[PDB]
């Protein structure tokens with residue numbers, strides 16, 4: 001399948017070079033996989049989700065996304081127009097309030113919830129969790145991410161937006177999950193992206209057009225935007241049977257575009273998520 005005039009990030013993910021505008025992908029499009037977007041929620045009624053999105057848990061007064069960020073992330077995972085994995089199932093877990101903030105205890109709870117909740121869902125091709133959040137190092141947040149991953153969910157987490165070594169941030173610094181840095185459309189490391197040896201992979205993170213609350217769309221930037229590209233790609237690849245939750249991050253790294261990025265500091269991988277699609 002080919003989506004023409006796609007958002008640049010989706011194009012980038014299916015090309016060996018920057019500058020293209022078509023997103024090439026297999027029609028399976030992540031069908032039968034499930035992605036949990038652990039964030040501010042998801043506006044499930046957005047037409048772009050085509051009924052494939054559902055809120056499953058909230059830690060606040062409502063399950064609504066009053067922020068936008070979770071909806072945006074979910075859209076890059078699996079909205080029709082803006083998503084990597086256009087037929088995946090999306091589950092929202094609202095661990096962040098409508099200001100986009102949340103206590104580590106809540107974020108942990110949300111991760112443990114997903115490890116359990118996945119056992120009640122029909123996700124025959126596998127389960128992904130996209131965590132576009134982070135703060136200062138916490139061994140207990142890391143251990144939560146590690147447990148989620150160990151439970152059989154492919155955990156993709158944002159590197160963080162401090163232009164710093166991601167080793168001081170959580171759950172970015174948990175080695176067992178898939179820590180995602182951001183790139184821009186010119187194949188530069190996004191100026192805000194964390195870096196370091198704990199990064200597994202880069203994805204498109206600057207000026208990413210996706211869904212937003214009120215049935216709207218908008219373009220925002222962040223490692224938060226890169227993570228769902230990688231999470232969507234994992235769901236997509238799992239649906240194709242190319243990899244499993246346990247080894248998707250490594251598969252993605254192994255099949256990545258290598259060496260294409262600029263301003264990558266010594267010690268950080270130069271790997272850009274790539275779907276390897278061939279028609």
Ligand SMILES: [Ca+2]
Pocket residue numbers: 016017257260
């Ligand atoms: Ca290249």
Ligand SMILES: [Ca+2]
Pocket residue numbers: 174175176177178179198199200249
């Ligand atoms: Ca890792």
